[PDB]
Amino acid sequence: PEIRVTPLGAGQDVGRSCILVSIAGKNVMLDCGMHMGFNDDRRFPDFSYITQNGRLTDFLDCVIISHFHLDHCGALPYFSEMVGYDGPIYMTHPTQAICPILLEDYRKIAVDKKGEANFFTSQMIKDCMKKVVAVHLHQTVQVDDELEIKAYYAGHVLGAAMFQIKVGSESVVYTGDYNMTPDRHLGAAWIDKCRPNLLITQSTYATTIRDSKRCRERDFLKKVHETVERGGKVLIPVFALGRAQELCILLETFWERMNLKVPIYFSTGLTEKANHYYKLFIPWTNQKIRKTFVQRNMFEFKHIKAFDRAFADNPGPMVVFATPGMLHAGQSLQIFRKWAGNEKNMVIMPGYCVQGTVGHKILSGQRKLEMEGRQVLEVKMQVEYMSFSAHADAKGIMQLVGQAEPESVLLVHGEAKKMEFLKQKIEQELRVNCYMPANGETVTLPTSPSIPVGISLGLLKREMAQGLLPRLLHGTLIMKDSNFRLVSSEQALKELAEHQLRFTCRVHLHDTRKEQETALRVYSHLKSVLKDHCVQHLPDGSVTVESVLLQAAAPSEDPGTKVLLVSWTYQDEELGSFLTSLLKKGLPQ
């Protein structure tokens, strides 16, 4: 009865997200990302941790993908096809649609811009897509007999989802990446009061709120206007499927004032595919777009360029949107390496740039680099790291944790310095456990699963029939036919060795008085101080509370002192015991 979580990727880093969860003997993989920046043998997660030189399908019964980013799904074809996992892979419909093209682009990069001795191919990418099982929003699929998973809304990118993993009473929620503040084309994350045993959250931004939405857009457009005022060019890179749409529409609306076209250097095929995917998956987008897509198509951009030409053009106000984000390789690095200038070569980073060369040094001066024939920049050259990535900040993370209300929390997809601060904040604020697992570290938690039992309707009703206003419930549990069925004693008899045991004692009364005193006066000894005893009135004269009767017979039939029958059972043993005790010698003449 334990939940063992071993993040062998993105434990205290961002990238190569791949988390193993063993909850009730069901071993699930929570992501299959890849790392960016690493050259060889560390791009993909360490799958030797799962008993290499063997069949992974036996060990893992379910593989879940949060969204289509390469640090969450990049190692999927290599993993599946190469290491031989033929089991199910769960991912939302937009994730299924947009995942293979990202893999194809990175495959093109690897075979052209680098070596490809130990990489996968397009046919092997398509082979992986066969095992995929698409899961809709809030679709509680039954991957196994007892294991079931539910996809929520994450708001990071199109099709990004938080995957609950419920088996029995135990449940684990993995948010992957998410944003609690809605974008211009994506809604806010939401999850019901799941109250799971563990909640695994991203922590790439444990910083404070990033100055709302309008202020950030205003600052970004002001920087763009400042750079283009002196005729400089702008070279923002982006992955072309995440925050690219928001930046595109924002800069287009800003350009409604002056009306000069802006070049979108993500491939025209890729741009068309992005527009089509966003129009096919309108339900996954914001209510802003969900209600206004019929009136007008905001994705029909009036400004676009194909590729290499306008990049090497005259120094105008042209702002390039490079196809590969993070400045790790591709068109982004090709343009950046050939661009310099005070107003020109404005490099605005919306992403995080987790460990990739060039891009990661946003906090640095961005004028040092590490490459052959490296260049230098100037202060006016934009190296601004605008907070436009669709990631929830600290306030969003606290909001999500309070919304879900988990028993415990775990942190991944972040930096150790930020994650320790976030863990301290969570522990000090919500009084809920938090964890700090590194890559390869196993985190184990105990579980307290309740026992599923069936209680009879009659006993259940009788529970509050007398216990609505100091109460108790007594019954017998029958673990018959390998199932648990709680019933009352009568239904226990009815199930199937009967031998009733009672108390109907005749205590020789010490009180030696009249017949009236012995019979009609002794029997009124219930209401003195005793409690939790029902009251029923009868004209004849007797005390009938459950298995209690005291008016027995004549006061002295046996040739001795007065004899009276005191009767009680084990549930009402208090009354009968007290009566017998005070009748043995407690009522003298």
Partner 1 sequence: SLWSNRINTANSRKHQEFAGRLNSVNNRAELYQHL
Partner 2 sequence: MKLYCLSGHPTLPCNVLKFKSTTIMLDCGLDMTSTLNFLPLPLVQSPRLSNLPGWSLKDLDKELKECSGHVFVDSVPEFCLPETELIDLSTVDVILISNYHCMMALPYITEHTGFTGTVYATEPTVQIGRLLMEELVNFIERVPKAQSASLWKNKDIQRLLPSPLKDAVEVSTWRRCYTMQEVNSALSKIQLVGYSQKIELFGAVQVTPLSSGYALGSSNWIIQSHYEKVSYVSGSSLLTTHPQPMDQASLKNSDVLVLTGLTQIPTANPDGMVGEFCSNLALTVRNGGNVLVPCYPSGVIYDLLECLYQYIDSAGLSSVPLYFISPVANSSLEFSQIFAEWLCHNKQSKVYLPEPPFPHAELIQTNKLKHYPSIHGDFSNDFRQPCVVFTGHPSLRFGDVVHFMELWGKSSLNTVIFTEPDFSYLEALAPYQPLAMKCIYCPIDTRLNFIQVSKLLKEVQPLHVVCPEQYTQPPPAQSHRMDLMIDCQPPAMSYRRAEVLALPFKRRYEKIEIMPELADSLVPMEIKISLATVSAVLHTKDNKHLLQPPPLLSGSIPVEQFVQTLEKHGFSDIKVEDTAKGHIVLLQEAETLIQIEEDSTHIICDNDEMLRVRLRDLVLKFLQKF
Could you list the residues that contact partner 1 (CB under 8 A)? 1, 4, 6, 8, 20, 22, 24-27, 41-42, 46, 48-52, 58-59, 438-444, 451, 477
- Asked if residue 485 binds partner 2 (CB under 8 A), the reply is yes
Q: Provide, rounded to whole angstroms, the least separation between the CB of residue 481 and partner 2.
A: 8
Among partner 1, partner 2, Zn ion, none, the one that 563 touches (CB under a kind-dependent 5 to 8 A) is: partner 2
Among partner 1, Zn ion, partner 2, none, the one that 460 touches (CB under a kind-dependent 5 to 8 A) is: partner 2
Among Zn ion, partner 1, partner 2, none, the one that 441 touches (CB under a kind-dependent 5 to 8 A) is: partner 1
Q: Provide, rounded to whole angstroms, the least separation between the CB of residue 294 and partner 2.
A: 5
| Backbone φ, ψ for residue 59 (5° rounding) | -70, -50
* Long-range pairs for 18-22: beta carbons < 8 A, 24 or more residues apart: 18/45, 18/75, 19/174, 19/200, 19/412, 20/49, 20/50, 21/165, 21/172, 21/174
d(CA 183, CA 69): 18
Q: Provide, rounded to whole angstroms, the least separation between the CB of residue 292 and Zn ion.
A: 27
Q: Provide, rounded to whole angstroms, the least separation between the CB of residue 497 and partner 1.
A: 21
- Asked if residue 130 binds partner 2 (CB under 8 A), the reply is no
Q: Which is nearer to partner 2, 436 or 477 (CB)?
A: 477
d(CA 7, CA 360): 23
Q: Which is nearer to partner 2, 159 or 325 (CB)?
A: 159
Three-class secondary structure of residue 321 per DSSP: strand
- Asked if residue 451 binds partner 2 (CB under 8 A), the reply is yes
d(CA 65, CA 72): 7
Token output for 323? 């196809």
Token output for 241? 């499927």
Q: Which is nearer to partner 1, 4 or 136 (CB)?
A: 4
Q: Which is nearer to partner 1, 440 or 541 (CB)?
A: 440
Window 312-331: residues binding partner 2 (CB under 8 A): none
Phi-psi label, residue 546: left if phi above 0, alpha if psi -120 to 50, beta otherwise: left
Instruction: Tell which residue, 213, 201, 208, 277, has the closest CA to residue 242.
Output: 277
Alpha helices in 540-588 (DSSP H): 573-584
d(CA 158, CA 179): 12
Query: How many CB atoms lie under 10 A from the CB of residue 226?
Result: 14
Q: Provide, rounded to whole angstroms, the least separation between the CB of residue 312 and partner 2.
A: 30
Q: Which is nearer to partner 2, 47 or 568 (CB)?
A: 568
Window 529-558: residues binding partner 2 (CB under 8 A): 547, 558
Q: Provide, rounded to whole angstroms, the least separation between the CB of residue 50 and partner 1.
A: 6
d(CA 403, CA 568): 53
Q: Which is nearer to partner 2, 229 or 490 (CB)?
A: 490
The footprint of Zn ion (CB under 5 A) covers 69, 71, 177
